[PDB]
Amino acid sequence: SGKRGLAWPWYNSPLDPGVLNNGDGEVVAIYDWETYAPPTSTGGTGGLGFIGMQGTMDSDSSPVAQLATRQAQQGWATVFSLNEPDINGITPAEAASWYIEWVNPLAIKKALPAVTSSTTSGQGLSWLSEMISACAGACYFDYINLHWYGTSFAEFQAYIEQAHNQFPSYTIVISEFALTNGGNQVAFFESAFPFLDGLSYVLLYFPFVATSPALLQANDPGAVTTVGTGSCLYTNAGGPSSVGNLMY
Ligand SMILES: OC[C@H]1O[C@@H](O[C@@H]2[C@@H](O)[C@H](O)O[C@H](CO)[C@H]2O)[C@H](O)[C@@H](O)[C@@H]1O
Ligand SMILES: [Cl-]
């Protein structure tokens, strides 16, 4: 049907995911970096499939002891694992043993931890390569999960092609991508959507970020500094932004 998803933050109570779901089927998924249902203005997900995410090894709001319980209650078809462990002081071996213990048991589609686009040893795809070696085939997974932030569509295209060249038998989900602050976000996503839509090895992609600029600044001011406000899919009024209009 389509590959587009909403990267839906915890602070999004005021907003309606259904605004970006016009029935044509391009937008199919939503995740909220947690294992509880997306906070929304309707209480529901606007007809999108929620993907559970165990983004840290354990937290108050997503206790890992409740991960199997939540998947069973909510009936997710897919689950995401750790968010950027490659820059959060989690070794590939630690992630492999944690994944085997906690994520393996969910008999659904599963993604390995979202890694950053760093080229440094022990980060990014180097980290992911070490985690797959530490797994030694004992991790069950369907997808590798990528983040990308950078300065041009050309650089993004080169990064996705690099990932595929290095992992050619693997399926990719992109859980966060945008330009860093300054660039034309509309031009970037106008280029990125048709590029990713044509790649049979990319199953899902989620622009950072399905919120409004006012909510981004009020709750994630660090992200405004890094990325700016141009990649927000919503206007402050809670309709589609210029980038949101590209989701339909
Ligand atoms: O993610 C890979 C595949 O995992 C499957 O669940 C696994 C069971 O089939 C397997 O025998 O048990 C393991 C370890 O408990 C489960 O992860 C999913 O059912 C598949 O959908 C998925 O493609
Ligand atoms: Cl990145």
Side-chain angles (χ1 to χ4, degrees), residues 24-56:
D24 291 356
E26 288 293 351
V27 186
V28 302
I30 176 164
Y31 85 102
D32 68 5
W33 289 267
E34 306 285 352
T35 57
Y36 62 81
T40 72
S41 60
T42 58
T45 62
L48 297 180
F50 183 52
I51 301 186
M53 176 169 159
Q54 184 71 53
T56 76

mmCIF file of all heavy atoms in Angstrom, residues 24-56:
data_model
loop_
_atom_site.group_PDB
_atom_site.id
_atom_site.type_symbol
_atom_site.label_atom_id
_atom_site.label_comp_id
_atom_site.label_asym_id
_atom_site.label_seq_id
_atom_site.Cartn_x
_atom_site.Cartn_y
_atom_site.Cartn_z
ATOM 1 N N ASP A 24 -6.026 7.347 0.949
ATOM 2 C CA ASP A 24 -5.297 6.857 -0.250
ATOM 3 C C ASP A 24 -4.222 5.810 0.112
ATOM 4 O O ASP A 24 -3.633 5.296 -0.796
ATOM 5 C CB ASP A 24 -4.671 8.013 -1.022
ATOM 6 C CG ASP A 24 -5.705 8.893 -1.702
ATOM 7 O OD1 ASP A 24 -6.921 8.554 -1.634
ATOM 8 O OD2 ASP A 24 -5.291 9.931 -2.270
ATOM 9 N N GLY A 25 -3.884 5.581 1.384
ATOM 10 C CA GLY A 25 -2.998 4.467 1.764
ATOM 11 C C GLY A 25 -1.495 4.755 1.696
ATOM 12 O O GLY A 25 -0.750 3.776 1.864
ATOM 13 N N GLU A 26 -1.006 5.991 1.522
ATOM 14 C CA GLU A 26 0.471 6.204 1.539
ATOM 15 C C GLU A 26 1.018 6.092 2.967
ATOM 16 O O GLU A 26 2.191 5.658 3.139
ATOM 17 C CB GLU A 26 0.925 7.542 0.956
ATOM 18 C CG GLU A 26 0.793 7.599 -0.553
ATOM 19 C CD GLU A 26 1.724 6.674 -1.317
ATOM 20 O OE1 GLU A 26 2.644 6.056 -0.735
ATOM 21 O OE2 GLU A 26 1.482 6.549 -2.504
ATOM 22 N N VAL A 27 0.214 6.488 3.929
ATOM 23 C CA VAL A 27 0.627 6.550 5.354
ATOM 24 C C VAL A 27 -0.035 5.378 6.092
ATOM 25 O O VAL A 27 -1.280 5.238 6.039
ATOM 26 C CB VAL A 27 0.281 7.897 5.992
ATOM 27 C CG1 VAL A 27 0.842 7.991 7.412
ATOM 28 C CG2 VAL A 27 0.785 9.076 5.165
ATOM 29 N N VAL A 28 0.784 4.506 6.672
ATOM 30 C CA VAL A 28 0.311 3.177 7.149
ATOM 31 C C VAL A 28 0.723 2.944 8.606
ATOM 32 O O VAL A 28 0.118 2.087 9.234
ATOM 33 C CB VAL A 28 0.817 2.062 6.225
ATOM 34 C CG1 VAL A 28 0.345 2.280 4.770
ATOM 35 C CG2 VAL A 28 2.331 1.907 6.319
ATOM 36 N N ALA A 29 1.622 3.725 9.189
ATOM 37 C CA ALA A 29 2.132 3.333 10.505
ATOM 38 C C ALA A 29 2.350 4.522 11.421
ATOM 39 O O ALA A 29 2.497 5.607 10.923
ATOM 40 C CB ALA A 29 3.404 2.555 10.309
ATOM 41 N N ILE A 30 2.511 4.247 12.717
ATOM 42 C CA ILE A 30 2.809 5.296 13.720
ATOM 43 C C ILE A 30 3.574 4.627 14.833
ATOM 44 O O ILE A 30 3.257 3.470 15.111
ATOM 45 C CB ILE A 30 1.497 5.965 14.203
ATOM 46 C CG1 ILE A 30 1.750 6.989 15.306
ATOM 47 C CG2 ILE A 30 0.449 4.933 14.669
ATOM 48 C CD1 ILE A 30 0.545 7.919 15.512
ATOM 49 N N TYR A 31 4.543 5.325 15.422
ATOM 50 C CA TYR A 31 5.289 4.851 16.609
ATOM 51 C C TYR A 31 5.538 6.087 17.471
ATOM 52 O O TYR A 31 5.479 7.181 16.877
ATOM 53 C CB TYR A 31 6.572 4.081 16.242
ATOM 54 C CG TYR A 31 7.820 4.900 15.984
ATOM 55 C CD1 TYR A 31 8.801 5.000 16.966
ATOM 56 C CD2 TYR A 31 7.993 5.636 14.813
ATOM 57 C CE1 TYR A 31 9.971 5.738 16.760
ATOM 58 C CE2 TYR A 31 9.151 6.381 14.590
ATOM 59 C CZ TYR A 31 10.153 6.420 15.564
ATOM 60 O OH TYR A 31 11.273 7.183 15.415
ATOM 61 N N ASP A 32 5.747 5.908 18.776
ATOM 62 C CA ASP A 32 5.801 7.016 19.762
ATOM 63 C C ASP A 32 6.986 6.863 20.710
ATOM 64 O O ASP A 32 7.031 7.526 21.790
ATOM 65 C CB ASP A 32 4.447 7.157 20.464
ATOM 66 C CG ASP A 32 4.092 5.992 21.380
ATOM 67 O OD1 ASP A 32 4.959 5.103 21.551
ATOM 68 O OD2 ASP A 32 2.928 5.986 21.897
ATOM 69 N N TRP A 33 7.963 6.072 20.270
ATOM 70 C CA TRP A 33 9.215 5.755 20.981
ATOM 71 C C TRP A 33 8.927 4.977 22.281
ATOM 72 O O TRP A 33 9.861 4.853 23.122
ATOM 73 C CB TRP A 33 10.021 7.024 21.247
ATOM 74 C CG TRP A 33 10.635 7.653 20.037
ATOM 75 C CD1 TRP A 33 11.892 7.416 19.571
ATOM 76 C CD2 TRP A 33 10.071 8.674 19.192
ATOM 77 N NE1 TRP A 33 12.141 8.205 18.486
ATOM 78 C CE2 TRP A 33 11.053 8.996 18.231
ATOM 79 C CE3 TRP A 33 8.885 9.411 19.190
ATOM 80 C CZ2 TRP A 33 10.872 9.980 17.268
ATOM 81 C CZ3 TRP A 33 8.689 10.368 18.219
ATOM 82 C CH2 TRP A 33 9.676 10.652 17.273
ATOM 83 N N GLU A 34 7.706 4.481 22.462
ATOM 84 C CA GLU A 34 7.292 3.823 23.717
ATOM 85 C C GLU A 34 6.406 2.591 23.405
ATOM 86 O O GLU A 34 6.052 2.313 22.208
ATOM 87 C CB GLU A 34 6.581 4.854 24.613
ATOM 88 C CG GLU A 34 7.332 6.128 24.918
ATOM 89 C CD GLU A 34 8.457 6.002 25.920
ATOM 90 O OE1 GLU A 34 8.615 4.928 26.560
ATOM 91 O OE2 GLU A 34 9.230 6.961 26.012
ATOM 92 N N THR A 35 6.069 1.840 24.446
ATOM 93 C CA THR A 35 5.154 0.666 24.368
ATOM 94 C C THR A 35 3.707 0.977 24.793
ATOM 95 O O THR A 35 2.895 0.046 24.739
ATOM 96 C CB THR A 35 5.703 -0.479 25.210
ATOM 97 O OG1 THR A 35 5.868 0.005 26.542
ATOM 98 C CG2 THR A 35 7.019 -0.972 24.646
ATOM 99 N N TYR A 36 3.373 2.199 25.204
ATOM 100 C CA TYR A 36 1.968 2.648 25.420
ATOM 101 C C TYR A 36 1.481 3.321 24.138
ATOM 102 O O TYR A 36 2.291 3.906 23.404
ATOM 103 C CB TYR A 36 1.860 3.543 26.653
ATOM 104 C CG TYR A 36 2.637 4.832 26.605
ATOM 105 C CD1 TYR A 36 2.126 5.943 25.932
ATOM 106 C CD2 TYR A 36 3.862 4.971 27.218
ATOM 107 C CE1 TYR A 36 2.803 7.148 25.884
ATOM 108 C CE2 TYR A 36 4.589 6.158 27.134
ATOM 109 C CZ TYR A 36 4.041 7.257 26.492
ATOM 110 O OH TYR A 36 4.689 8.455 26.419
ATOM 111 N N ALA A 37 0.168 3.247 23.901
ATOM 112 C CA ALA A 37 -0.539 3.804 22.732
ATOM 113 C C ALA A 37 -0.269 5.302 22.589
ATOM 114 O O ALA A 37 -0.167 6.028 23.589
ATOM 115 C CB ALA A 37 -2.024 3.510 22.830
ATOM 116 N N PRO A 38 -0.206 5.814 21.333
ATOM 117 C CA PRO A 38 0.057 7.243 21.076
ATOM 118 C C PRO A 38 -0.917 8.175 21.785
ATOM 119 O O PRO A 38 -2.123 7.960 21.733
ATOM 120 C CB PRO A 38 -0.087 7.368 19.566
ATOM 121 C CG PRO A 38 0.251 5.959 19.059
ATOM 122 C CD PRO A 38 -0.341 5.035 20.099
ATOM 123 N N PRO A 39 -0.445 9.171 22.553
ATOM 124 C CA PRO A 39 -1.341 10.211 23.062
ATOM 125 C C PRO A 39 -1.758 11.153 21.929
ATOM 126 O O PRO A 39 -0.882 11.793 21.308
ATOM 127 C CB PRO A 39 -0.518 10.971 24.111
ATOM 128 C CG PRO A 39 0.705 10.087 24.351
ATOM 129 C CD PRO A 39 0.935 9.356 23.035
ATOM 130 N N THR A 40 -3.073 11.261 21.732
ATOM 131 C CA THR A 40 -3.707 11.935 20.599
ATOM 132 C C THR A 40 -4.975 12.658 21.075
ATOM 133 O O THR A 40 -5.474 12.363 22.204
ATOM 134 C CB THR A 40 -4.018 10.947 19.471
ATOM 135 O OG1 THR A 40 -5.105 10.137 19.923
ATOM 136 C CG2 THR A 40 -2.820 10.110 19.067
ATOM 137 N N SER A 41 -5.464 13.557 20.230
ATOM 138 C CA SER A 41 -6.644 14.392 20.542
ATOM 139 C C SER A 41 -7.885 13.503 20.547
ATOM 140 O O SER A 41 -8.818 13.895 21.254
ATOM 141 C CB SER A 41 -6.819 15.523 19.566
ATOM 142 O OG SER A 41 -6.982 15.044 18.234
ATOM 143 N N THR A 42 -7.929 12.416 19.752
ATOM 144 C CA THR A 42 -9.094 11.474 19.653
ATOM 145 C C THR A 42 -8.957 10.329 20.666
ATOM 146 O O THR A 42 -9.962 9.572 20.889
ATOM 147 C CB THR A 42 -9.221 10.848 18.262
ATOM 148 O OG1 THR A 42 -7.979 10.175 18.025
ATOM 149 C CG2 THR A 42 -9.497 11.868 17.171
ATOM 150 N N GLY A 43 -7.754 10.116 21.212
ATOM 151 C CA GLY A 43 -7.422 8.872 21.929
ATOM 152 C C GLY A 43 -7.062 7.721 20.981
ATOM 153 O O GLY A 43 -6.633 6.669 21.461
ATOM 154 N N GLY A 44 -7.327 7.837 19.682
ATOM 155 C CA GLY A 44 -6.957 6.769 18.721
ATOM 156 C C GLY A 44 -5.841 7.197 17.762
ATOM 157 O O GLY A 44 -5.261 8.308 17.960
ATOM 158 N N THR A 45 -5.543 6.351 16.766
ATOM 159 C CA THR A 45 -4.346 6.506 15.888
ATOM 160 C C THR A 45 -4.802 6.806 14.469
ATOM 161 O O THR A 45 -4.026 6.606 13.562
ATOM 162 C CB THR A 45 -3.460 5.257 15.950
ATOM 163 O OG1 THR A 45 -4.250 4.169 15.464
ATOM 164 C CG2 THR A 45 -2.986 4.971 17.354
ATOM 165 N N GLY A 46 -6.039 7.240 14.275
ATOM 166 C CA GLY A 46 -6.389 7.839 12.979
ATOM 167 C C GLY A 46 -6.376 6.793 11.891
ATOM 168 O O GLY A 46 -6.124 7.175 10.724
ATOM 169 N N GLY A 47 -6.616 5.530 12.271
ATOM 170 C CA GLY A 47 -6.595 4.333 11.394
ATOM 171 C C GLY A 47 -5.176 3.845 11.052
ATOM 172 O O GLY A 47 -5.036 3.048 10.145
ATOM 173 N N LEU A 48 -4.130 4.353 11.694
ATOM 174 C CA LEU A 48 -2.758 3.877 11.406
ATOM 175 C C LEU A 48 -2.408 2.715 12.341
ATOM 176 O O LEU A 48 -2.848 2.741 13.515
ATOM 177 C CB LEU A 48 -1.803 5.051 11.647
ATOM 178 C CG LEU A 48 -2.035 6.244 10.732
ATOM 179 C CD1 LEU A 48 -1.041 7.337 11.053
ATOM 180 C CD2 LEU A 48 -1.961 5.833 9.273
ATOM 181 N N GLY A 49 -1.575 1.773 11.882
ATOM 182 C CA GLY A 49 -1.101 0.657 12.715
ATOM 183 C C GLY A 49 -0.007 1.159 13.653
ATOM 184 O O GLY A 49 1.038 1.675 13.159
ATOM 185 N N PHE A 50 -0.216 1.026 14.953
ATOM 186 C CA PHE A 50 0.794 1.346 15.992
ATOM 187 C C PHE A 50 1.843 0.244 16.038
ATOM 188 O O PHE A 50 1.495 -0.969 16.150
ATOM 189 C CB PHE A 50 0.171 1.503 17.359
ATOM 190 C CG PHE A 50 1.129 1.888 18.453
ATOM 191 C CD1 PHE A 50 1.974 2.969 18.331
ATOM 192 C CD2 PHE A 50 1.156 1.160 19.627
ATOM 193 C CE1 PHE A 50 2.841 3.306 19.360
ATOM 194 C CE2 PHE A 50 2.061 1.463 20.631
ATOM 195 C CZ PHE A 50 2.916 2.544 20.490
ATOM 196 N N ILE A 51 3.094 0.696 16.027
ATOM 197 C CA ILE A 51 4.308 -0.134 16.214
ATOM 198 C C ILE A 51 4.850 0.198 17.601
ATOM 199 O O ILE A 51 5.247 1.376 17.800
ATOM 200 C CB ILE A 51 5.330 0.162 15.107
ATOM 201 C CG1 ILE A 51 4.717 -0.142 13.730
ATOM 202 C CG2 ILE A 51 6.624 -0.616 15.403
ATOM 203 C CD1 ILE A 51 5.656 -0.019 12.560
ATOM 204 N N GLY A 52 4.755 -0.780 18.528
ATOM 205 C CA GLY A 52 5.363 -0.698 19.861
ATOM 206 C C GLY A 52 6.855 -0.422 19.762
ATOM 207 O O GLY A 52 7.497 -0.939 18.823
ATOM 208 N N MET A 53 7.437 0.286 20.737
ATOM 209 C CA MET A 53 8.879 0.445 20.712
ATOM 210 C C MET A 53 9.474 0.389 22.114
ATOM 211 O O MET A 53 9.101 1.229 22.954
ATOM 212 C CB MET A 53 9.262 1.742 20.015
ATOM 213 C CG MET A 53 10.747 1.982 20.061
ATOM 214 S SD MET A 53 11.253 3.359 18.976
ATOM 215 C CE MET A 53 12.836 3.771 19.715
ATOM 216 N N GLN A 54 10.389 -0.550 22.318
ATOM 217 C CA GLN A 54 11.136 -0.612 23.589
ATOM 218 C C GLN A 54 12.457 0.150 23.374
ATOM 219 O O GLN A 54 13.477 -0.445 22.951
ATOM 220 C CB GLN A 54 11.255 -2.075 24.008
ATOM 221 C CG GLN A 54 11.931 -2.258 25.366
ATOM 222 C CD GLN A 54 11.042 -1.799 26.490
ATOM 223 O OE1 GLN A 54 9.885 -2.232 26.605
ATOM 224 N NE2 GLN A 54 11.620 -0.977 27.356
ATOM 225 N N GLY A 55 12.413 1.447 23.592
ATOM 226 C CA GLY A 55 13.468 2.350 23.114
ATOM 227 C C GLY A 55 14.656 2.380 24.042
ATOM 228 O O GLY A 55 15.734 2.786 23.579
ATOM 229 N N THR A 56 14.447 2.073 25.321
ATOM 230 C CA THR A 56 15.515 1.888 26.321
ATOM 231 C C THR A 56 15.374 0.489 26.927
ATOM 232 O O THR A 56 14.317 -0.187 26.704
ATOM 233 C CB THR A 56 15.476 2.978 27.398
ATOM 234 O OG1 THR A 56 14.404 2.700 28.304
ATOM 235 C CG2 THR A 56 15.338 4.360 26.797
#
